[PDB]
Amino acid sequence: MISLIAALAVDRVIGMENAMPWNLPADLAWFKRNTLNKPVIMGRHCWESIGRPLPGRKNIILSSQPGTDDRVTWVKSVDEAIAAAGDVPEIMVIGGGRVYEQFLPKAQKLYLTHIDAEVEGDTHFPDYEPDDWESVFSEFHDADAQNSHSYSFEILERR
Ligand SMILES: NC(=O)c1ccc[n+]([C@@H]2O[C@H](COP(=O)([O-])OP(=O)(O)OC[C@H]3O[C@@H](n4cnc5c(N)ncnc54)[C@H](OP(=O)(O)O)[C@@H]3O)[C@@H](O)[C@H]2O)c1
Ligand SMILES: CN(Cc1cnc2nc(N)nc(N)c2n1)c1ccc(C(=O)N[C@@H](CCC(=O)O)C(=O)O)cc1
Ligand SMILES: [Ca+2]
Ligand SMILES: [Ca+2]
């Protein structure tokens, strides 16, 4: 199955100037826990904002151009990305916005972090139909010394 994993601020903002405008160690821990030992698919812009392969994951990068880094697997279409991931239980799609938009119709699960942050953004999570989805896990956390916003973790499953 295909799952999307994303962190969304107010108004579904997911980025600004190729960066993520918040500091949430707890979200990074959640991200790692839910992507480790699974293939991860990302757009070229979202790769460039990392610049190093994520360890313990098969890193698959979508680009219309030839790849520039042999440490990761480069593919030129959605269907090639899916195929490159292979016969695994769960393929994780990690962004950014244009990649999320293309994989959302194919996804069975959404792993969302709702961050209580008012951030100007230039990139937004796609506007999904709420009726298509059922909340199966939800956990809220207050802001603390390490995490400067409150946030909730949510898993939605396609009905
Ligand atoms: N969880 C999150 O909140 C989260 C996660 C990740 C990223 N982000 C943010 O997302 C933003 C980047 O999003 P974005 O939409 O600009 O870029 P993106 O989706 O990461 O990357 C877009 C690029 O991927 C390639 N691509 C996408 N679909 C393709 C296809 N079907 N076939 C071939 N190539 C394809 C193209 O590369 P070429 O131009 O090379 O063809 C395209 O320009 C940044 O602000 C980043 O910080 C947020
Ligand atoms: C910019 N970016 C994309 C990013 C960040 N947070 C997210 N959060 C969620 N919930 N979903 C995402 N797709 C997501 N993507 C990054 C940046 C750094 C690391 C990173 O270093 N991750 C380590 C965490 C190790 C560390 O703490 O340095 C890992 O093993 O996954 C991952 C993604
Ligand atoms: Ca806040
Ligand atoms: Ca509606």
TrEMBL record:
Coiled coil feature spans: none
Annotated transmembrane regions: none
EC class: oxidoreductase
Calcium as UniProt keyword: yes
Reaction(s) this enzyme catalyzes, per UniProt: (6S)-5,6,7,8-tetrahydrofolate + NADP(+) = 7,8-dihydrofolate + NADPH + H(+)
GO CC annotations on file: cytosol
EC number: 1.5.1.3
InterPro entries the record matches: DHFR (IPR012259), DHFR-like_dom_sf (IPR024072), DHFR_CS (IPR017925), DHFR_dom (IPR001796)
Residues at which substrate binds: 5, 27, 52, 57, 113
Binding-site list for Ca(2+) 1: 116, 149
Boundaries of every DHFR domain copy: 1-158
Residue numbers binding NADP(+): 7, 13-19, 44-46, 63-64, 76, 95-102
Pathway the protein contributes to: Cofactor biosynthesis; tetrahydrofolate biosynthesis; 5,6,7,8-tetrahydrofolate from 7,8-dihydrofolate: step 1/1
Residues binding Ca(2+) 2: 159
Family: Belongs to the dihydrofolate reductase family.
NCBIfam families in alphabetical order: PRK10769.1
Protein name: Dihydrofolate reductase
Annotated source species: Escherichia coli
